[PDB]
């Protein structure tokens, strides 16, 4: 708010603000613009298609235990247990809610976000890339791995002779990445630092509420009490100008971080477009090694892309002609 | 006001341990959210008066003149005085001037937290609808092949410049 | 025949530049309207202060007026800086899109159009550009039965470019994304391995001249 931040219930401070005028309106239009732009990033990072699907009931998927990515029916927030553990690892609401630090509630719930992620995962897993271009065209899953192998220039007979070992390796990889996300907190850091960075930004904001701009007190009402308005205004203008420039610097820091996270969100949406809806040949852009699969998982203000990739293991040199 | 310093906000009964000569339970925001009664050994939680935050939801002037208004972060579970048609209690806040239907429709005008409103011969509100839901059956041999092959065109817009100027 | 009537229908298309134009306009309006303002001054006009008051104590209003004007123009120039940065990034993306979608056929899915991209055509605009992407979309489909392995003479065979299709009346092989019902011939399939390691195995015949 313009007034009740920079003033109390003293309308003379608002009168001096109206003497200055219209500078807080620029901050208001800036914050509304960055808020609706963040909402735009959110709605065009996940809601690629309005045609929402759901999973088939049975899992005959070639011995692929997809239980960690499948939405758990026991939990009312029917999301993947991976996402449940991610929410558990993520760590200040009501005290900030009534001080002019008016947090805007998110227009998109985590339930519908998880629903969209589940829908796109189901569409990829039952149709491949066919739903990405146009209508959803279902395909057999071994057909999907065969075409994935042909995407990286690999013939399909080797897949159809060691798909059992491929399934066992994939299940082991799923178990080890489940342990790995629970192993170190470094994976959570790229979102935790953002959350606590916004928290300390608002914290130094509320500290600079109690900042002395050369007056007797940070509060103005006692200054208005001990001295007449012929006297106190020469302090009042200095305090309100200091609060105004502090707000401008805070808004500037807000918008530069908004631009940075906007570029990050654009890159994330690009990777969702490329790595998830198809097999890109951009090396290390869809993960290191030859990219095969990629699944996204939701997170508070974020998304984790897991990537299933080929690496060679055993080799031998031979004479070449 | 109590012993010098003052405050503004509603007062409830605190339920936390206080020390001898303990008078201020100020948090990391340095706000007097808890105070000791200067008469008896009674403890007070201090929570400030709730602000508003007012937005108006209305279609076009050529469209209609019926409006609705949201006060965000208002726990009506009130302070509305002159009420309108009906009251609803979104997680965003307290909304009047509209009614909530039991079906979900397209989010042409978003209100927030999955709540979206529109115009029917009346202003209506609903939960956000995900879209058309269908599941394609999967089998060990089920495959789909397209038959007709059409051509579409898409238009996109990208900025280039702004007005170069000097002062 | 769509796109002209598509563009004259709604102003939401060019609104993505109209907002920038009017935002620059209202920014300049704010800068020219902040001349009439109170930076602690008795009047918002300089030579009126210099006329109605003596110099040597008038500068205590002139300096705060100066600081207010400098703060206003500094905020203006920083906001111009951030807009210039983001529009430069978007224009670099536009130049990349012109370098890929117009000068070739990129494989970046849903980047040079929607669906399988074929063509791209640029058209200029005041401080802007629009791209026309001609793409392919499938219209409607039909369901079929799949079997990868065809074992002839006890020998496994896999179709090379396409998959086996079971019409029920007859049994063919087609391409990967569309339908071309084609008879079994040796050039369509590669031969490898035994017939005891695969799922979806089926028995059928092959042609040789």
Residue numbers in the entry:
A (entry chain C): 733 to 823, 845 to 1074
B (entry chain B): 538 to 614, 629 to 671, 686 to 732
C (entry chain B): 928 to 1136
What's the publication's text?
Since late 2022, XBB* variants, especially XBB.1.5 and other XBB derivatives with a proline on residue 486 (486P) on the receptor-binding domain (RBD) of the virus Spike glycoprotein (S) started to dominate, which demonstrated enhanced binding to human ACE2 while maintaining extremely strong capability of evading humoral immunity. Interestingly, L455 and F456 are two adjacent residues on the receptor-binding motif (RBM) of SARS-CoV-2 RBD, and the variant is just the “flipping” of the two residues, L455-F456 to F455-L456, also known as the “FLip” mutant. These two sites are also located on a critical epitope that targeted by the public IGHV3-53/3-66 Class 1 NAbs. L455F caused strong affinity reduction on XBB.1.5, but significantly improved the hACE2-binding affinity of XBB.1.5+F456L. Both L455 and F456 are on the core of the RBD-hACE2 interface, forming a compact conformation with D30 and K31 on ACE2.
Furthermore, multiple independent XBB lineages with both F456L and L455F are growing rapidly in different countries, such as XBB.1.5.70/GK.* in Brazil, the United States, and Canada, and HK.3 (EG.5.1.1.3) in China. To elucidate the disparities in binding affinity between XBB.1.5, XBB.1.5+F456L, and XBB.1.5+L455F+F456L (“FLip”) spike proteins with ACE2, we determined the structures of these three spike proteins individually in complex with hACE2 to interrogate the conformational change on their RBD-ACE2 binding interface. As we expected, all three spike trimers mainly showed two ‘RBD-open’ and one ‘RBD-closed’ conformations with one or two ACE2 bound. Consistent with DMS results, L455F significantly dampens hACE2-binding affinity of XBB.1.5 RBD, and F456L also slightly weakens the binding to hACE2. Surprisingly, although neither of the two mutations increases hACE2 affinity alone, their combination XBB.1.5+L455F+F456L exhibits significantly higher affinity than XBB.1.5. In contrast, “FLip” not only rescues the accelerated dissociation, but also facilitates association, synergistically improving the receptor binding at both thermodynamic and kinetic levels. Our structural analyses reveal that “FLip” mediates substantial conformation change on the RBD-hACE2 binding interface, which involves the remodeling of not only 455/456, but also Q493 on RBD and H34 on hACE2. Above all, the flip of L455 and F456 lead to synergistic effect of residues around and reorganize the interface between “FLip” RBD and ACE2 so that enhanced binding affinity can be obtained.
